[PDB]
Amino acid sequence: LNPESADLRALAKHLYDSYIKSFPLTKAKARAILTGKTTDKSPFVIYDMNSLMMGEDKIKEVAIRIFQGCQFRSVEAVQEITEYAKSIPGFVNLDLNDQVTLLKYGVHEIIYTMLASLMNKDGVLISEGQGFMTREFLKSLRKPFGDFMEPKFEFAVKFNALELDDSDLAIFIAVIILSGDRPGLLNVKPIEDIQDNLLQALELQLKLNHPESSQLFAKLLQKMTDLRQIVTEHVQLLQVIKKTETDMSLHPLLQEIYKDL
């Protein structure tokens, strides 16, 4: 109903379109799988060691093998997030060093945001929705691996209570990427100008898509604080594993992201 609000609607639709093309497992598909809907197939459930071995047939010790699988999927997600970032208007026109800095510090916050879409209080979807690993099984793994996912479930349960959908999440993750407060940025003003447009589009999106949810925009921005805490704790646990497991190797792409965080 306004020239400016029409541009914000166009930006919201552009990003939702790019989000669908970049991320193969959407929140809508994940919910259809988690709530037994007829549009998708039921997953094989891994709740103990026997189901894990039968799951490896259907779909290093156990804990390290699961940890390696998570880091493989995180590498895949970095690739998907990088592809999505390039579709955000203005992102590819930024200084190349700043594009790398924004992704270095942004990918982990986005991974945990999108991981919540695959989670409920009972567990997490794996193998592109083919499987489901229980929260209790992950918590039963030998230390320090049994503590890696628990804080992610705590965040996911709170974040999922906002009931965001894919069109909401597309603009939210773009806002996370264009954060002008990352360490080492050379040209902050161009980044903040883009983030302002994205925040304007996110605000209008949440008002139209959730007309009964008061201050959902503020509640969602307050979750960006929960995401930082999760990222910091995750890095601390990786340092513990680095010294305890001299045999374990971390992917080069993930190695560069963690350096000097």
Numbering used by the authors: 204 to 262, 275 to 476
Question: Any passages from the paper?
Answer:
We hypothesized that the absence of hyperglycemia in mice treated with MTX-531 stems from the molecule’s unique ability to act as an agonist of the nuclear hormone receptor PPARγ. Time-resolved fluorescence resonance energy transfer (TR-FRET) competitive binding assays showed MTX-531 to be a weak agonist of PPARγ (IC50 = 2.5 μM) and inactive against PPARα and PPARδ at concentrations as high as 100 μM. The three-dimensional complex of PPARγ and MTX-531 was solved from crystals diffracted to 1.9-Å resolution. The final solved structure contains two molecules of PPARγ (chains A and B) and one molecule of MTX-531 bound to chain B. The PPARγ ligand-binding region is known to be a large, mostly hydrophobic cavity capable of binding a wide variety of small molecules. The quinazoline core of MTX-531 appears to sit in a pocket of PPARγ formed by stacking of the aliphatic side chains of L330 and R288. Our working hypothesis is that the agonistic activity of MTX-531 against PPARγ counteracts PI3K-driven hyperglycemia.
Here we evaluated the pharmacological profile of MTX-531 that was computationally designed to selectively target two key resistance drivers, epidermal growth factor receptor and phosphatidylinositol 3-OH kinase (PI3K). The reversed binding mode of the quinazoline core between EGFR and PI3Kγ was an important element in the design of MTX-531, which shows low-nanomolar potency against both of its intended targets.
